[PDB]
């Protein structure tokens, strides 16, 4: 029986507990005695499992927390639309997209920072933005600043509604645990209503607003002269002027004569040649199909009527001879443990963000996006980073489940148990394959460096010496390019230019050309495979040995996050799963930095550039230079760092400042990573003496940071430094040569 269940007025709305720091924890509510308390107060603020044992109260807390997050995001979107309406050059950009740089941030004229307002065109001065909002807004059919302003007000109103919803569903009407545990109903409603009705309503907006406005914009008529969207809904004669299908109305829909809707529901493929983006008619058909698919998918699970599947029954039905009880117990795990759910959802959400990065570079969905090289680099890089972070988080919360929620007396000879029971075999095989990948992938680079240094280029791994061609990827590429002729007859062109074919250019710049894969591409892909496998090794080892190992047989009783178990047994520093997340974070940084470097150099070398033949940004040096480390060091980092290092005295000077600042923060992290808190505690003792001598010793006792906090501060400043460094490099480079 699926129904609404709610408790009335559980928690009174009062400012009392705001005035009592650490009220949520019985330990921290005693007050502060040393400085450690403060850090604890912020570290355990949102760890709701350590607050209460009651799953209902925890579930309510996470629900209202999620509402808070959504309100914050709505404030953020409201801000972006408002700054796009009031402090931007969006209309001028609409009138000339190929020669006006998108800018939506202006600085005030104080202390000389006014220089950051550069000549972006359109009679405007500001910082060129690379988020891609202008291309998104043109694709949505927005033409005036007024519509953006109204969207800003709407998003602010929605943020107020989200914070009211949070307060309401925590303090006034807070859902019960059996409401939260209706996962079959939740899947039905989210697959139908969210994804399904989302893409249906978006396809509605596209077909009714986007297609005509962008068809006129591609035709060339002045945006102010283009009819307003409500007129397009009101007078169907205009819709029939652009696409005659609309003359017949919704009669071909209900009579199943859908072929007459071919004017705006197409299957062209490729890119719009005058605009460099995917066809909005293809995107409209795509969202209609997606809508129908998800609405079909959302009627699968049984709720209040006999029809529908049962999650526990589908899980308990798939059992084989090799796995024993199979998927028995997993339903119970995934309907009582928030951390298991968070692990799964983070893994797929991160992976999905990486897929978003690749598919959005390869098949540019917004108009005048592919030739906004800065926007393309920024979007790819950004979503790749977000992805990687969410994957590391997935490993983290998997381990947190393994320590806090795992209970084998409901989980006995099961998939999870067998994984735990042959973890040594798993980790040893992963270990070997990581060493193998490392040796042969990195060893080719070291081999090439040595041969190149010794004056023997004929002994290198390259396209002219000993070739290592990516035959499989080339075959898949060729197949994908030849697909419209045989295996996808209704396709006018391939889904992406990178498979092969011609060349689409907009405003003299290359939007997309065919990407060729050679020995250097082989080598970087196996580097990627190596780094990903190592990251998986660390995280998976962390989750499999979170409970016990031959070294620490009772590791589970020590918790998820703990420094060690002492210098005995040879030394047990960093045995915790938290410390495995810490190392996985460093390795994730390594992997994704080489990934975004691959993308940057490959695009600037073999894809981007001006059309006269195509003159690429770096002349095509990738195929011969990307086989040695010296080649990456000289032709990529050193060569392309010119723009960032000589950005002083111009509008890009902030990128030089943040280059230096990021280098500094990265280095600053090394003190925390390389040192230990005993030294710092003793130093603080001497300083405390000095303060005592002058009667200024605080009542809250100065303590060195904990071992785990030293590691956390270390990795956070390390990531911030490195990532911000590559950020400044990338943005200064691509804005100056773009």
Partner 1 sequence: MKDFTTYLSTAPVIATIWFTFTAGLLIEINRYFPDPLVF
Partner 2 sequence: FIGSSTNLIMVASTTATLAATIVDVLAMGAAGHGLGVGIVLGLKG
Partner 3 sequence: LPGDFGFDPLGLLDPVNSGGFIEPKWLQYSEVIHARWAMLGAAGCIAPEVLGAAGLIPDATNIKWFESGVIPPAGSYNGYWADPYTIFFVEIVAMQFAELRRLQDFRYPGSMGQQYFLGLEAIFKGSGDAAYPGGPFFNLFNLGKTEAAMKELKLKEIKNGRLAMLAMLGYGAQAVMTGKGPFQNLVEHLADPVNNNILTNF
Ligand X SMILES: CCCCCCCCCCCCCCCC(=O)OC[C@H](COP(=O)(O)OC[C@@H](O)CO)OC(=O)CCCCCCCCCCCCCCC
* Residues at the contact surface with ligand CLA, assessed by CB under 6 A: 4, 6, 63, 66-67, 70, 111, 161-162, 164-165, 168-169, 173, 175, 179-180, 182, 185-186, 189-190, 193-194, 200-201, 203-204, 207-208, 233, 236, 239, 246, 249-250, 253, 288, 431, 434-435, 438-440, 442-444, 446-447, 450, 459, 534, 537-538, 583, 586
Q: Is 167 annotated as a binding residue?
A: no
Handedness of CA 492, 497, 502, 507 (dihedral sign): positive
Interatomic CA distance for residues 267 and 288, integer angstroms:
13
Q: How many Cα atoms sit within 13 Å of 405 on the Cβ side?
A: 24
The pair of three-digit structure tokens given for residue 141, joined into one six-digit string:
């059919």
Name residues contacting ligand X, limited to 325-384 (CB under 6 A). Answer: 326
Name residues contacting partner 2, limited to 285-314 (CB under 8 A). Answer: 296, 299, 305-307
Smaller CB separation from partner 2, 293 or 720: 293
51, 176, 312, 528: residue in contact with partner 3 (rule CB under 8 A): 176
Interatomic CA distance for residues 698 and 704, integer angstroms:
15
Name residues contacting partner 3, limited to 236-265 (CB under 8 A). Answer: 249-251, 253-255
320, 489, 568, 613: residue in contact with ligand X (rule CB under 6 A): 320
Interatomic CA distance for residues 496 and 361, integer angstroms:
10
Smallest CA-to-CA distance from 364 within 479, 273, 293, 489 is with 273
Could you say which of partner 1, ligand X, ligand CLA, none residue 442 binds, taking C-beta under 5 to 8 angstroms by partner kind? ligand CLA
Is 7 a binder of partner 3 (CB under 8 A)?
A: yes
Is 455 a binder of ligand SF4 (CB under 6 A)?
A: no
Binding-site size, ligand X (CB under 6 A): 7
Smaller CB separation from ligand X, 275 or 414: 414
Name residues contacting partner 2, limited to 235-274 (CB under 8 A). Answer: 255-259
The pair of three-digit structure tokens given for residue 49, joined into one six-digit string:
């499992």
Could you say which of ligand X, ligand CLA, partner 2, none residue 318 binds, taking C-beta under 5 to 8 angstroms by partner kind? ligand X
Using the contact rule CB under 6 A, the part of the chain among 132-140, 314-322, 347-355, 612-620 near ligand X is 314-322
The pair of three-digit structure tokens given for residue 24, joined into one six-digit string:
């949520």
Is 425 a binder of ligand X (CB under 6 A)?
A: no
Could you say which of partner 1, ligand SF4, ligand CLA, none residue 573 binds, taking C-beta under 5 to 8 angstroms by partner kind? ligand SF4
Smallest CA-to-CA distance from 207 within 181, 185, 237, 239 is with 239
Buried b (16+ CB within 10 A) or exposed e, 675-711: eebeebeeebeeeeeeeeeeeeeeeeeebbbbbbbbb
CB 645 within 8 A of CB 638: no
Instruction: Report the 10 Å Cβ neighbour count for 279.
Output: 23
Is 111 a binder of partner 1 (CB under 8 A)?
A: yes
Could you say which of ligand X, ligand CLA, partner 2, none residue 239 binds, taking C-beta under 5 to 8 angstroms by partner kind? ligand CLA
Helices 338-362 and 55-86 meet at what angle, rounded to 10? Answer: 30
Concatenated DSSP letters for 435-473? HHHHHHHHHHHHHHHHHHHTT-GGGSBSSSSB----HHH
Is 19 a binder of partner 1 (CB under 8 A)?
A: yes
Q: Which residue is nearest to ligand SF4 (CB)?
A: 573
CB 445 within 8 A of CB 563: no
Q: What is the chain's alpha carbon radius of gyration, rounded to the nearest angstrom?
A: 29
Q: Is 671 annotated as a binding residue?
A: yes
Smaller CB separation from ligand CLA, 559 or 661: 661
The pair of three-digit structure tokens given for residue 603, joined into one six-digit string:
């695009």
Q: Between β-strands 509-512 and 504-506, what pairing exists: parallel, antiparallel or unpaired?
A: antiparallel
Q: Tell me how long the chain is.
A: 738
Smaller CB separation from partner 1, 111 or 256: 111
CB of 112 to partner 1, least distance (A): 8
Is 573 a binder of ligand SF4 (CB under 6 A)?
A: yes
CB-based contacts of 519: which residues, under 8 Å, 6+ apart?
A: 461, 462, 463, 467, 468, 469, 623, 627
Helix (H, G, I), strand (E, B) or coil at 396: helix
Interatomic CA distance for residues 302 and 298, integer angstroms:
11
Q: Is 680 annotated as a binding residue?
A: yes
Smaller CB separation from ligand SF4, 73 or 564: 564
Could you say which of ligand X, partner 1, ligand SF4, none residue 558 binds, taking C-beta under 5 to 8 angstroms by partner kind? none
CB of 258 to partner 2, least distance (A): 7
Binding-site size, partner 3 (CB under 8 A): 20
18, 254, 305, 674: residue in contact with partner 1 (rule CB under 8 A): 18
Place of tokens 């080598």: 523
Q: Between β-strands 118-121 and 124-128, what pairing exists: parallel, antiparallel or unpaired?
A: antiparallel
Is 696 a binder of partner 1 (CB under 8 A)?
A: no
Smaller CB separation from partner 3, 261 or 599: 261
Binding-site size, partner 1 (CB under 8 A): 9
Place of tokens 């420094």: 563
Could you say which of ligand CLA, partner 1, partner 3, none residue 230 binds, taking C-beta under 5 to 8 angstroms by partner kind? partner 3
Name residues contacting ligand SF4, limited to 618-677 (CB under 6 A). Answer: 676
Question: Which long-range CB contacts under 8 A does 569-574 form with residues at least 24 apart?
Answer: 574/711
User: Binding site membership for [4Fe-4S] cluster: which residues?
Assistant: 564, 573
User: Binding site membership for chlorophyll a': which residues?
Assistant: 663
User: Binding site membership: which residues?
Assistant: 564, 573, 663, 671, 679-680
């Amino acid at each position: 029986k699926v129904k609404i269940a709610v408790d009335r007025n559980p928690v009174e709305t009062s400012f009392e507990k705001w005035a009592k720091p650490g009220h949520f924890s019985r330990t921290l509510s005693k007050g502060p005695n040393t400085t450690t308390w403060i850090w604890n107060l912020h570290a355990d603020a949102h760890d709701f499992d350590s607050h209460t044992s009651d799953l209902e109260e925890i579930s309510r807390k996470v629900f209202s927390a999620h509402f808070g997050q959504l309100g914050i995001i709505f404030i953020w979107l409201s801000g972006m639309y408002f700054h796009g309406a009031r402090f931007s050059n969006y209309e001028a950009w609409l009138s000339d997209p190929t020669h006006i740089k998108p800018s939506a941030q202006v600085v005030w004229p104080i202390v000389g920072q006014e220089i950051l307002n550069g000549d972006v065109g359109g009679g405007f001065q500001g910082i060129q933005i690379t988020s891609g909002f202008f291309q998104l807004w043109r694709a949505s059919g927005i033409t005036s600043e007024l519509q953006l302003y109204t969207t800003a007000i709407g998003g602010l109103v929605m943020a107020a509604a989200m914070f009211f919803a949070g307060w309401f569903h925590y303090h006034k009407a807070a859902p019960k645990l059996e409401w939260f545990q209706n996962v079959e109903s939740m899947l039905n409603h989210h697959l139908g209503g969210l994804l399904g009705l989302g893409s249906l309503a978006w396809a509605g907006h596209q077909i009714h607003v986007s297609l005509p406005v962008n068809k006129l914009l591609d035709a060339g008529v002045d945006p102010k002269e283009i009819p307003l969207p409500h007129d397009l809904l009101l007078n169907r004669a205009i819709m029939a002027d652009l696409y005659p299908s609309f003359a017949k109305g919704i009669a071909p829909f209900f009579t199943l004569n859908w072929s007459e809707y071919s004017d705006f529901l197409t299957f062209k493929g490729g890119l719009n040649p005058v605009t460099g983006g995917l066809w909005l008619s293809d995107t409209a058909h795509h969202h209609v199909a997606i809508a129908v698919l998800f609405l079909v998918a959302g009627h699968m699970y049984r709720t209040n009527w006999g029809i529908g599947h049962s999650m526990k029954e589908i899980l308990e039905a798939h059992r084989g001879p090799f796995t024993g009880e199979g998927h028995v117990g997993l339903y119970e795990i995934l309907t009582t443990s928030w951390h298991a759910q968070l692990a799964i959802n983070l893994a797929l959400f991160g992976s999905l963000s990486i897929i978003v990065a690749h598919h959005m570079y390869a098949m540019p969905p917004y108009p005048y996006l592919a030739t906004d090289y800065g926007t393309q680099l920024s979007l790819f890089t950004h979503h790749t980073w977000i992805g990687g972070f969410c994957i590391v988080g997935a490993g983290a919360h998997a381990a947190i489940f393994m320590v806090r929620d795992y209970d084998p007396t409901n989980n006995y000879n099961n998939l999870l148990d067998r994984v735990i029971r042959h973890r040594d075999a798993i980790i040893s095989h992963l270990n070997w394959v990581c060493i193998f990948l490392g040796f042969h992938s990195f060893g080719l680079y070291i081999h090439n460096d040595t041969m190149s240094a010794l004056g023997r280029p004929q002994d290198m791994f390259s396209d002219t010496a000993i070739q290592l061609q990516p035959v499989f990827a080339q075959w898949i590429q060729n197949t994908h390019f030849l697909a419209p002729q045989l295996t996808a007859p209704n396709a006018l062109a391939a889904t992406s230019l990178t498979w092969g074919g011609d060349l689409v250019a907009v405003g003299g710049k290359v939007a997309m050309m065919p990407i060729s894969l050679g020995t250097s591409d082989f080598m970087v892909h196996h580097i990627h495979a190596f780094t990903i496998h190592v990251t998986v090794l660390i995280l998976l080892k962390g989750v499999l040995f979170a409970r016990s190992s031959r070294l620490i047989p009772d590791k589970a009783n020590l918790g998820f996050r703990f420094p060690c178990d002492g210098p005995g047994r040879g030394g047990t520093c960093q045995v915790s799963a938290w410390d495995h997340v810490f190392l996985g974070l460093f390795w994730m940084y390594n992997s994704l930095s080489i990934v975004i470097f691959h993308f940057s150099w490959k695009m600037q070398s073999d894809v981007w550039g001006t059309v006269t033949g195509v003159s690429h940004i770096t002349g095509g040096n990738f195929a011969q230079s990307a086989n040695t480390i010296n080649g990456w060091l000289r032709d990529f980092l050193w060569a392309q760092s010119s723009q960032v290092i000589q950005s002083y005295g111009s509008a890009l000077s902030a990128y030089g400042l943040i280059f230096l600042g990021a280098h500094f923060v990265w280095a600053f992290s090394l003190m925390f990573l390389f040192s230990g808190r005993g030294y710092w505690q003793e130093l603080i003792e001497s300083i405390v003496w000095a303060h005592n001598k002058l009667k200024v010793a605080p009542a809250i006792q100065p303590r060195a940071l904990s071992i785990t906090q030293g590691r956390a501060v270390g990795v956070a400043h390390y990531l911030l430094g490195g990532i911000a460094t590559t950020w400044s490099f990338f943005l200064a480079r691509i804005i100056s040569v773009g």
